[PDB]
């Protein structure tokens, strides 16, 4: 079966790349919210990218990860990696 991550795996990922101690994360709902309107700039979804793809197996075009305006967007974009993933 392809291990594919759900909402609340990439919600806890979305949680990594805020959990710098500061505040203004999401913490929460998120999905269908932009990136950008989650106080989530390039260096911090990068930083959530990061955490998946290596964990996981995969590597995301930087690109892309700039083509990705939504997490639910973004899961998706993991989860065709994951289908093609270890």
């Given at each position: 079966?392809?291990?594919?991550?759900?909402?609340?795996?990439?919600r806890r990922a979305l949680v990594e790349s805020a959990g710098e101690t500061d505040?203004?994360?999401?913490?929460?709902?998120f999905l269908d919210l932009r990136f950008e309107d989650i106080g989530y700039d390039s260096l911090?979804?990068?930083?959530?990218?990061?955490?998946?793809?290596s964990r996981y197996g995969v590597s995301i075009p930087d690109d892309v990860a700039g083509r990705v305006?939504?997490?639910?967007?973004?899961?998706?974009?993991?989860?065709?990696?994951?289908?093609?993933?270890?």
């Open positions: 079966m392809a291990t594919l991550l759900t909402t609340d795996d990439l505040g203004t994360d999401l913490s929460g709902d911090a979804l990068m930083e959530t990218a990061a955490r998946l793809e305006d939504t997490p639910r967007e973004l899961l998706d974009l993991i989860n065709g990696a994951l289908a093609e993933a270890a």
